[PDB]
């Protein structure tokens with residue numbers, strides 16, 4: 382019978398350890414590494430016991446519960462992690478819910494800092510196993526929903542970079558570009574998974590199902606509806622699980638799904654060839670991001686099945702999900718150029734037209750132009766991508782982030798500074814990722830990445846709500862979030878923040894920051910300016926940041942750093958007020 386044995390045997394020891402360290406780092410984000418390693422040994426030992434006897438030890442119990450019992454075993458928790466000991470005194474299947482609800486999307490943690498190359502390679506040389514325990518633990522605690530088996534994949538890429546670079550001439554010059562690139566992939570991965578989890582948990586299984594139906598219909602245009610559907614069903618269970626902290630099950634299930642798709646690759650995509658050769662993680666990663674197969678030629682016009690067919694209303698009425706799944710499949714596989722959110726928006730339009738029209742005396746006369754009515758929904762996002770790409774190319778990264786920071790702060794000034802600056806910085810990454818593709822490739826690139834970034838604002842804001850406008854964009858339809866945020870003008874009801882000296886007065890710590898961190902400091906300041914003076918002009922703002930820049934250059938090459946900051950700090954505070962009013 383025993384679950385931990387089945388799972389142990391299934392994913393094998395190596396992945397088993399990692400998934401259990403991930404599980405523990407996800408539930409208990411503030412515990413020291415050394416504490417988590419012990420919980421993992423104690424759990425590994427148990428599975429190698431349930432390897433012997435199916436009835437030998439606690440092997441009868443659900444995984445939810447083996448994790449349950451291990452946390453509360455050390456009451457050391459009640460103190461630094463005594464908020465969720467409220468959960469330890471409760472029971473299943475109600476307890477494990479308490480645990481999951483306290484996952485902190487923004488734990489109070491210093492940044493994961495990366496050591497000098499010499500030092501990082503030394504740590505990896507001395508103890509490799511400890512090294513990647515540390516890594517899984519530092520990423521998973523900071524991103525409590527990261528897609529667990531993709532995390533394993535990234536650990537493995539990370540080790541391949543240290544192997545290549547640690548013996549090198551200049552270790553730094555070899556590591557830095559490669560780590561920085563790996564880090565960016567992992568952030569995007571974390572943001573995509575957080576979106577799946579939020580769709581599932583906040584808007585229901587169906588909302589991710591539809592999303593995954595569209596995306597897989599674009600990716601695998603030749604595969605038939607019943608196959609896509611089967612893939613959509615299994616991938617739903619996969620992410621429902623991972624999103625719920627059932628990582629052993631998720632990893633195992635995701636493996637069967639990779640296997641099933643390779644074993645049936647003939648009738649899915651020719652591009653599956655690239656993936657099916659590969660060892661497990663590499664294979665499932667490859668699948669998970671495969672570029673779109675080409676559209677089969679000779680498909681009938683979509684109007685035949687969805688406008689002229691005499692059973693349109695009977696289909697919609699008698700089997701709604703089946704019929705509208707088909708609409709999504711058919712429409713999406715033929716539109717790799719559209720974003721997922723757009724396609725879902727067309728689904729919603731089509732459905733609302735049917736609902737309304739099929740309840741009239743003459744449904745056909747009412748819905749005949751439904752596909753033609755998609756045009757203005759297609760044009761809004763295409764226009765926006767184009768205007769914003771020209772702005773990106775015109776201003777460059779930093780000034781584009783600046784313009785979005787100003788626009789967003791005026792939009793939702795109640796939002797906290799670190800969130801506004803994070804969210805603006807992500808918005809400017811989209812310019813860089815996407816505006817170099819030709820016109821046709823741009824929309825799915827931009828709009829799908831916007832989803833991920835808006836979701837990130839929505840999860841942060843859910844924790845501590847402060848803006849009615851965010852809450853509204855974030856909780857109405859998932860698929861309208863981008864248009865919803867787009868349509869917000871400046872919030873003219875916000876009462877400007879008091880002028881606040883220490884949010885504007887600077888100290889010598891700051892001189893140690895690399896230029897990239899100084900940018901964030903300039904950008905944090907700009908946000909506080911816009912909060913203080915929401916009608917400030919772009920020239921006003923450029924002049925205050927300009928002064929900030931001069932203060933920094935000046936006091937950062939002083940021998941007496943604290944005392945130049947004292948002479949100049951308050952002289953900035955005084956020139957800011959003057960420029961601003």
Ligand SMILES: C[C@H](C(=O)O)c1ccc(C(=O)c2cccs2)cc1
Nearest residue numbers: 765766769770808811812863866867
């Ligand atoms: C949702 C938000 C907004 O306008 O408030 C938004 C909308 C569109 C874009 C946009 O089109 C681009 C960003 C980067 C390159 S193009 C950026 C941000």
